[PDB]
Amino acid sequence: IANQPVVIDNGSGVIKAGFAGDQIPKYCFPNYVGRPKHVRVMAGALEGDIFIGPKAEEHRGLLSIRYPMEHGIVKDWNDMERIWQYVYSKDQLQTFSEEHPVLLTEAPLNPRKNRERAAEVFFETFNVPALFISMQAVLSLYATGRTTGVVLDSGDGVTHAVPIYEGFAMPHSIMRIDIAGRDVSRFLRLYLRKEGYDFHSSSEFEIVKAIKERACYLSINPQKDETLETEKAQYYLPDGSTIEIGPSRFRAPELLFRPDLIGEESEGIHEVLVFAIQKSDMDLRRTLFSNIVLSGGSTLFKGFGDRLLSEVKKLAPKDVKIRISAPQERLYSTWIGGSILASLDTFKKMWVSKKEYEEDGARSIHRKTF
Amino acid sequence: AALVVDNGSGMCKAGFAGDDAPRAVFPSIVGRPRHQGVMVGMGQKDSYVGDEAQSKRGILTLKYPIEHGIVTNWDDMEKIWHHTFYNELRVAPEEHPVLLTEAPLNPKANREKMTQIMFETFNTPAMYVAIQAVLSLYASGRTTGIVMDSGDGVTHTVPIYEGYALPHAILRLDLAGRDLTDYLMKILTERGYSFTTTAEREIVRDIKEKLCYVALDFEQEMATAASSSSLEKSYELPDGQVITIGNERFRCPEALFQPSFLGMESCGIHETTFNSIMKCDVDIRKDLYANTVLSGGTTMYPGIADRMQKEITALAPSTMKIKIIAPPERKYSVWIGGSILASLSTFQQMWISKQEYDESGPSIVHRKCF
Amino acid sequence: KEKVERDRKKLARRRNYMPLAFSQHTKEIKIEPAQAVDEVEPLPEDYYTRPVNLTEVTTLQQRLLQPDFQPICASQLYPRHKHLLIKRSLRCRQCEHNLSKPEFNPTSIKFKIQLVAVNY
Amino acid sequence: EKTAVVIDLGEAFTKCGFAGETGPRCIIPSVIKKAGMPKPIKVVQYNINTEELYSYLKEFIHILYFRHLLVNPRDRRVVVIESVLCPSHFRETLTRVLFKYFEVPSVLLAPSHLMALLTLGINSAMVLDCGYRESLVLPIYEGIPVLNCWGALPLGGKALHKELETQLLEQCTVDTGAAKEQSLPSVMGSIPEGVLEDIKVRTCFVSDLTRGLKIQAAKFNIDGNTERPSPPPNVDYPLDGEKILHVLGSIRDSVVEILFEQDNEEKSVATLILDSLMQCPIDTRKQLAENLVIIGGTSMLPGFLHRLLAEIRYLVEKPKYKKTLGTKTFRIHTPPAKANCVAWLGGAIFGALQDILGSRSVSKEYYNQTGRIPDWCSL
Ligand SMILES: Nc1ncnc2c1ncn2[C@@H]1O[C@H](COP(=O)(O)OP(=O)(O)OP(=O)(O)O)[C@@H](O)[C@H]1O
Ligand SMILES: Nc1ncnc2c1ncn2[C@@H]1O[C@H](COP(=O)(O)OP(=O)(O)O)[C@@H](O)[C@H]1O
Ligand SMILES: Nc1ncnc2c1ncn2[C@@H]1O[C@H](COP(=O)(O)OP(=O)(O)O)[C@@H](O)[C@H]1O
Ligand SMILES: [Zn+2]
């Protein structure tokens, strides 16, 4: 069917939907299911037992937040079906899923059962004309408009580094670590309890993510800022109460660059970028250092590019040019890539038709992926 | 009275010369704890080694000191040798002379620094480095024939005819047990079961040793794996959780025979064994086909010998008879050779003494290596 | 063992010989760890359908005065020995002595060295 | 050397005594009776000005070191037991009080969970700490606390005291002694915390899982007609002499259920162990599960250990925890001292080790020089 394809980013934190024609995603809402915290027997309470996106944000304190997708993998599929149904609601897009074809953006090196079940839902529950699963990293390059480039895509659920040179992705050089934005939000909650402010509730976890997003700066030297006495910058909560964050502000997102501090066995965001380049062939190393692209929401931390440049330089070889080319629209970079890809006439060949999936089998989605 | 100490990348096999099997066999690893700023409890060792670190895997970050038969961290290797002599063997290094094993075509600094420690740190009376492949022949009571000694660190092919080695015919391949273990993690992550940490990698090695087997026809085995669930076997983890690895069982050891899977762009363990025989003199080829030995624990995969014979026979001429030598004790084939060598009265002269080391230096080892 | 390890490590750092092997390097007490019960004793069925006399059960204050085995029932609660009191003596930061009390403070209101702001 | 003192400053009660003893010498409510104030102010209070906190702790430590313990503070060392993730400024103040005012030789800031493990003798064990403010859990594996896999919920003493006060005010039946033989509701606007605590301990108990699960659905009234078990008899409690409060049988066995209630989120005192254990490393699972430790005075409540261990094994079968923690054998450790005084006993056992104490502990000479107490946060 010729009618405009619907791009949808499967972001663990925020799913971004919209049409391929639009330069930006019109409808982007948080990826969580909202049910009433108190188990509702009586009338005059929150009805439906389902609150998604803007409806949830309004009555947030009353509801109990449950993320359906963890570490770029779908844990509860029933929840994810309701989320994708809300994408084709009167609230967002307001269209038939049966008419328009779909593009998914699954993280690299995900389970094959995750891709197979994702297709089954979108072909059976929704009567889609055609579906195409793609890598988040490959899209990010289409948006910026360069063929060569390493893509350090720091999402909410997973942070992954994929090196692609002249439209060729080395699949062995891909590096994936689970320590992402959501873990930084979890570790900030621990440090906020060490400052003396508890956020025990699942609703109260959402305002820790807001505190992180508002006020958390990455110091170039962490040891100097610790010895220096903090200003203790006040943050205002939804109720109106003030909280002085203090040293927790800067030593929370540090755990990205040094995850051994809390006690998580991972490489680190500076390390995975360098290791991904060093794993690739010697001839390409210089060009891959010379073309690095930051993607996702967990790069927007104040002074992230400043710290990463410094942490990469000392690990990388001496007298090598390191350009970390961040776009202005890092959060919405992954979708814009899909929107451009979808618009091209080549995409018509790439996607798998509904009749193709019935005849060919299950492999059809996997083999056409690349 | 003399000590044989195999310095394998996977496992360190140590024991007394003359004995049938090695006394102490432990995994060659150093376990440093994921410590926070919180104070630690009692009975705390700063760095654990071997069977102790194998018991306390959960918290300790497992760091293999020897990578591809090259000692990367010498301070770590020193702590293993200290655990080998004093604790495991219960013997003074000053009393007994120590035989060590190095893989062929290793860096010259490795053999140099190895002996320097044995002479200075441990104060050994005599020290001789030997090629692992040269020892492995003595195990089978065969002077003539090639060996395919595939270890955890490296795999090497050393052709030796009538007690005379062909140095230029020796070929080294970096593909080994640890690369297969790393490969098995990736394909298990594709199935669903994610293993990231250093402790988890050790559990994946236990899965590999028990279940994984070499297929005769890979394409035929993949067809049976797709249709029937007969090859699918269950394994219980340290946790009560059980996993069904399926087709990935026989997919892991395939990487040996076709490195393209791992993405090394090199010849297979079958093809390198053929290439090594062809590099040798035309006359002696006959005996090398007739006496092809498989050594190390990477040749203890069920049915590697059958697959090896098939692949060599196809490459080799039709008239030639290809017999693969697979003794029951392949894991301890390097050590048992060392025990036979050290015991022989002829070898008494070949030892490098302290007096010889003191006058000449550590460079003397390169002359009296092989 | 940790003291000897820490001492041996510290004198090796102080020496700064880079762990030079001059001489040869390198009875045990083993406690059995407490056995874990499969099922802990349930609440007795008496507690259900029985009048609770507040005289029989003990309050928190009198429970906590006997901390070694704080008993719920009154019949278990034994009388503890009477707590000894203290005779304070003050000493300043800059100054040394200030005031103090006799060795027979029992049944005495005399100060060995009388010093107070109202008395100067 | 002298036998080092052990102090354990809590919101409800403080444990005090000397090292190498069977239990604590003094255990008292953590408050101070200041002139003018009718109700005594609480000594530990998080999120206040440092100067006001300094004065309260100075006043409290003085009472511990002279009226309760009889020993010179400057002479002998200190072993300060405080829970992990204790507020930064509070711990900084507590040390600054001991080092500046009292001039103690050296303080050792031991985490309560690691101390509780020493008392049993086992090197690795899961430790739940059901205290006054928050019920915290922290897996300890072979001496190393795993901060990565922490867990806390506000289902302790404070949350239980508040729940009791609410229920009593609804079904309020007091005999004032002024033609108040008839049921009189809410004669007093609020009930003092001292009374509520005494009612909780004596009257209220923890129900069986089978009876408790019915009580949860009963008070909910989820399309059912009077589906509650038969309650215990109503107990009459004196308030301030003349006023006799008749405590309803339902309140006794319903007040506790707020701890073990799911409340949609699936966040109980029971769930917190399994939520933490699932997040732990795959190798550590079977060792931690087999070695459970239940400290804190909230777990002293009669029939708590049976309900918890039962509620665990029920929540195991639930589909979320059924995959990972399905075929696991959960066994509880019985510590030598009582559930309240497990934390203290560890510090005393540790305090008896004079050789290790001096090395690990922070000396006054170091603090006066630097002015930087070591913590699990960055240095
Ligand atoms: N029965 C088995 N089946 C399959 N793989 C095995 C088996 N036993 C061991 N392995 C794998 O092969 C490796 C064999 O290591 P081994 O014990 O031979 O020591 P090594 O370090 O390789 O020494 P060397 O290089 O001297 O042979 C192990 O690390 C493991 O990954
Ligand atoms: N301005 C910001 N500053 C700091 N962190 C941010 C900011 N915006 C988003 N984040 C973090 O990044 C997350 C968004 O990740 P996102 O880019 O949507 O991932 P994905 O690429 O998988 O869609 C948020 O949940 C938050 O943790
Ligand atoms: N022996 C006991 N029996 C029953 N309940 C008790 C007992 N001792 C204390 N409690 C209750 O449990 C709580 C335990 O708190 P505690 O652990 O002493 O404080 P903290 O957590 O601040 O160290 C008290 O507030 C009290 O309500
Ligand atoms: Zn003076």
Query: B199: domain CATH number?
Result: 3.90.640.10
B268 touches B258 (CB < 8 A): yes
d(CA D71, CA B199): 50
State CA A32 to chain mean position distance.
Answer: 13
Extract the tokens encoding A282.
């010697």
Enumerate residues 6+ apart whose C-beta is below 8 A from D366: none
User: Are both B6 and B95 inside the same structural domain?
Assistant: yes
Ligand 1 pocket, Cβ-based, cut-off 6 angstroms: B 6, 8-11, 101, 132, 151-153, 177, 181, 205, 208-209, 296-298, 300-301, 331, 334
d(CA A153, CA A176): 10
What is the Cα gyration radius of chain D?
23
Sign of the Cα pseudo-torsion (A278, A283, A288, A290, in order): positive
Enumerate residues 6+ apart whose C-beta is below 8 A from B351: B97, B126, B127, B128
Q: C81: nearest CA in chain D? A: D25
The pick from B105, B298, B301, B333 for probing ligand 1's pocket by mutation, whose C-beta has the most ligand atoms within 8 angstroms, reads B298
Expressed in Å, this structure's resolution amounts to 4.1
CB-CB neighbours of D172 under 10 Å = 17
Helix or strand or coil: residue B346?
helix
d(CA A63, CA A282): 53
State CA A273 to chain mean position distance.
Answer: 17
Q: Which chains touch D (3 or more CB pairs under 8 A)?
A: A, B, C
- A267 reaches B (C-beta below 8 A): no
Helix or strand or coil: residue B30?
strand
Enumerate residues 6+ apart whose C-beta is below 8 A from D240: none
Asked whether the beta carbons of residue B36 and residue A262 sit closer than 8 angstroms, the reply is yes
Please state, in angstroms and as integers, the Cα–Cα distance from residue D226 to each residue in A343, A345, B183, D221, D230, following that order. Answer: 63, 67, 61, 8, 11
d(CA B286, CA B145): 9
Give the nearest partner residue to D143 out of B42, B237, B238, using CB atoms. B42
| φ/ψ (deg, to 5) at B278 | -70, -35
Sign of the Cα pseudo-torsion (D251, D257, D258, D263, in order): negative
Neighbours of ion ligand 4 (CB under 5 A): C 92, 94-95
3-state helix, strand, coil in chain D (%, to 5): 40, 15, 40
d(CA B153, CA B8): 7
| φ/ψ (deg, to 5) at D344 | -55, -45
Extract the tokens encoding D182.
């008839």
Chains C, A in contact: 3+ Cβ pairs under 8 A?
Answer: no
Burial class of residue D256 in the structure, from the number of CB atoms within 10 Å of its CB (0-12 exposed, 13-18 middle, 19+ buried): buried
CA of D201 to the centre of ligand 3 (A): 9
Query: Which string of b and e fits C16-51 if b means at least 16 CB within 10 Å?
Result: eeeeeeeeeeeeeeeeeebebeeebeebeeebbeee
CA of D94 to the centre of ligand 4 (A): 27
D128 touches D293 (CB < 8 A): yes
Burial class of residue A204 in the structure, from the number of CB atoms within 10 Å of its CB (0-12 exposed, 13-18 middle, 19+ buried): middle
CA of A58 to the centre of ligand 2 (A): 20
B155 touches B173 (CB < 8 A): yes
Residues of D in contact with A194 (CB under 8 A): 85-88, 377
Helix or strand or coil: residue B180?
helix
Please state, in angstroms and as integers, the Cα–Cα distance from residue B280 to each residue in A356, B171, B192, B275, following that order. Answer: 54, 11, 47, 9
d(CA D316, CA D293): 18
Q: Which chains touch C (3 or more CB pairs under 8 A)?
A: B, D
User: Are both B326 and B349 inside the same structural domain?
Assistant: no
Question: What's the one-letter identity of residue D325?
Answer: L
Measured between alpha carbons, how far apart are the two ends of chain C, in Å? 59
Helix or strand or coil: residue A133?
strand
Q: Long-range contacts: C62-71, Cβ < 8 Å, 24+? A: C63/D201, C64/D13, C64/D27, C64/D28, C67/D23, C67/D24, C67/D27, C67/D338, C67/D340, C67/D341, C68/D22, C68/D23, C68/D337, C69/D338, C70/D338, C70/D340
d(CA B72, CA B50): 18
Q: How many residues does chain B have?
A: 370
d(CA C115, CA C95): 13
d(CA D133, CA D122): 28
Asked whether the beta carbons of residue C54 and residue D208 sit closer than 8 angstroms, the reply is no
Helix or strand or coil: residue D106?
strand
Give the nearest partner residue to A194 out of D88, D220, D263, using CB atoms. D88
The alpha helices in A198-268, defined as continuous H runs, are: 202-214, 222-227, 248-251, 254-257
d(CA A185, CA A204): 11
| Closest Cα to atom 10 of ligand 3 | D297
Chains C, D in contact: 3+ Cβ pairs under 8 A?
Answer: yes
- The candidate with the shortest Cα–Cα distance to D141, out of B189, B60, B199, A370, is B60
Sign of the Cα pseudo-torsion (D252, D253, D254, D257, in order): positive
Give the HSE-up count for residue D277: Cα atoms under 13 Å, Cβ half-sphere: 32
Q: Where in chain A is the domain with CATH 3.30.420.40?
A: 1-136+334-368, 137-178+267-333
Experimental method: cryo-EM
d(CA D126, CA D139): 5
Atom of ligand 2 nearest to the CA of A216: 4
Residues of C in contact with D230 (CB under 8 A): 49
Q: Is the CB of A25 under 6 A from ligand 2?
A: no
- The candidate with the shortest Cα–Cα distance to A134, out of A354, A361, A341, is A341
Window B:248-277, CB contacts with A under 8 Å: 262-263
CA distance D295 to chain C (A): 15
Query: Kind of pairing, strands A73-74 and A69-70?
Result: antiparallel
A191 touches A248 (CB < 8 A): yes
User: Are both B169 and B286 inside the same structural domain?
Assistant: yes
Extract the tokens encoding B146.
């090639």
User: Are both B89 and B205 inside the same structural domain?
Assistant: no
Atom of ligand 1 nearest to the CA of B330: 18
d(CA B168, CA B343): 29
Extract the tokens encoding B273.
């064994």
CA of C75 to the centre of ligand 4 (A): 55
Extract the tokens encoding B285.
């080829």
Asked whether the beta carbons of residue D140 and residue B41 sit closer than 8 angstroms, the reply is yes
Extract the tokens encoding B47.
């760095």
Window C:25-64, CB contacts with B under 8 Å: 25-26
d(CA D256, CA A296): 45
Report DSSP state, residue A194.
H
The alpha helices in chain B, defined as continuous H runs, are: 51-55, 74-82, 108-120, 132-139, 177-191, 198-211, 218-227, 248-251, 254-257, 269-279, 285-290, 304-315, 333-343, 354-360, 364-367
The helix (run of H) or strand (run of E) holding residue A29 is: strand A27-30
d(CA C86, CA D63): 11
CA of A157 to the centre of ligand 2 (A): 10
Asked whether the beta carbons of residue D220 and residue A41 sit closer than 8 angstroms, the reply is yes
d(CA D46, CA D57): 12
Extract the tokens encoding B3.
């000590």
d(CA A173, CA A163): 7
Extract the tokens encoding D286.
């079977």
| φ/ψ (deg, to 5) at A155 | -85, -170
User: Are both B248 and B361 inside the same structural domain?
Assistant: no
- A244 reaches B (C-beta below 8 A): no
Enumerate residues 6+ apart whose C-beta is below 8 A from D6: D15, D16, D17, D18, D19, D24, D79, D81, D344, D347, D348, D351
The pick from A140, A300, A336 for probing ligand 2's pocket by mutation, whose C-beta has the most ligand atoms within 8 angstroms, reads A300
CA of D172 to the centre of ligand 4 (A): 60
User: Are both B1 and B108 inside the same structural domain?
Assistant: yes
Please state, in angstroms and as integers, the Cα–Cα distance from residue A349 to each residue in A20, A140, A341, A352, D18, following that order. Answer: 16, 21, 12, 8, 80
A69 touches A208 (CB < 8 A): no
B60 touches B76 (CB < 8 A): no
| Closest Cα to atom 22 of ligand 3 | D10
Query: Kind of pairing, strands A102-106 and A6-9?
Result: parallel
CATH architecture assigned to D157-259: Alpha-Beta Complex (3.90)
CB-CB neighbours of C73 under 10 Å = 9
Extract the tokens encoding A176.
């994936």
Q: C19: nearest CA in chain B? A: B121
Extract the tokens encoding D245.
């409060």
| φ/ψ (deg, to 5) at D261 | -70, 140
Query: Kind of pairing, strands B155-161 and D151-153?
Result: unpaired
With vertex at residue A112, the alpha carbon angle to CA A107 and CA A118, rounded to the nearest 5 degrees, is 75
The helix (run of H) or strand (run of E) holding residue B129 is: strand B126-131
What is the Cα gyration radius of chain C?
30
Helix or strand or coil: residue D216?
helix
Q: Is the CB of D144 under 6 A from ligand 3?
A: no
Measured between alpha carbons, how far apart are the two ends of chain A, in Å? 22
Report DSSP state, residue B39.
P
Q: Is the CB of D361 under 6 A from ligand 3?
A: no
The ligand placed nearest to the CA atom of residue D15 is: 3
Provide the CATH number for the domain formed by A1-136+334-368 in this structure.
3.30.420.40
Helix or strand or coil: residue B245?
coil
d(CA A57, CA A29): 10
CATH architecture assigned to A179-266: Alpha-Beta Complex (3.90)
The helix (run of H) or strand (run of E) holding residue D58 is: helix D50-63
Enumerate residues 6+ apart whose C-beta is below 8 A from A18: A6, A7, A24, A25, A26, A27, A28, A93, A335, A339
Residues of A in contact with D134 (CB under 8 A): 198, 200
The pick from D298, D338, D341 for probing ligand 3's pocket by mutation, whose C-beta has the most ligand atoms within 8 angstroms, reads D298
The ligand placed nearest to the CA atom of residue A151 is: 2
Q: Read off the CATH number of the domain in which B314 is found.
A: 3.30.420.40
Give the HSE-up count for residue A316: Cα atoms under 13 Å, Cβ half-sphere: 23
Provide the CATH number for the domain formed by A137-178+267-333 in this structure.
3.30.420.40
Last residue of a domain, one of B246, B266, B286: B266
Domain membership of residue B30 as a residue range: 1-132+334-370
- C82 reaches B (C-beta below 8 A): no
Tokens 């966040």 belong to which residue?
Answer: D267
Query: Which string of b and e fits A13-28 if b means at least 16 CB within 10 Å?
Result: bbbbbbbbeeeebebb
CB-CB neighbours of D367 under 10 Å = 19
Number of domains forming the structure of chain B:
3
Query: Kind of pairing, strands B66-67 and B242-244?
Result: unpaired
CB-CB neighbours of B358 under 10 Å = 10
d(CA B6, CA B12): 6
A297 touches A331 (CB < 8 A): yes
